[PDB]
C-alpha cells in the first residue's frame, strides 16, 4: 500500500506538472523581471534627456 501510494503520488505530480500552467511562476518571474529591466535600460537609452 505504501509503494502504491508513493507511485500514485509521483504519477499525480507528473500529470499536474504537465498541464502547461503549473506552479512555475516563481521561476518565470525572475527571468521576466530581468528581461524587463534590460529592455527598460535600452528604452531609456532611447531618450534625449
Amino acid at each position: 500500500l505504501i509503494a502504491n501510494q508513493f507511485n500514485s503520488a509521483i504519477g499525480k505530480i507528473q500529470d499536474s506538472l504537465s498541464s502547461t500552467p503549473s506552479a512555475l511562476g516563481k521561476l518565470q518571474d525572475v527571468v521576466n523581471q530581468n528581461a524587463q529591466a534590460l529592455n527598460t535600460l535600452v528604452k531609456q537609452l532611447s531618450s534625449n534627456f
Partner: protein
Amino acid sequence: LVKNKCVNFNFNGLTGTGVLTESNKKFLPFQQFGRDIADTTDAVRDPQ
C-alpha cells in the same frame, strides 16, 4: 561602397562607426533612414 567591413559613414549628415552587411529584407520606397529599435540607425539609404 565597401560592404562587409567596418567603416565610418556620413550618409546624409549621419556620422558614425560600424560594420555593414547585406540584408534581404525589403524596405518601403519612402524610407531612407532606419531606427529599428533603441534610438540607433539600423538602416540608411545610400543616395547613389
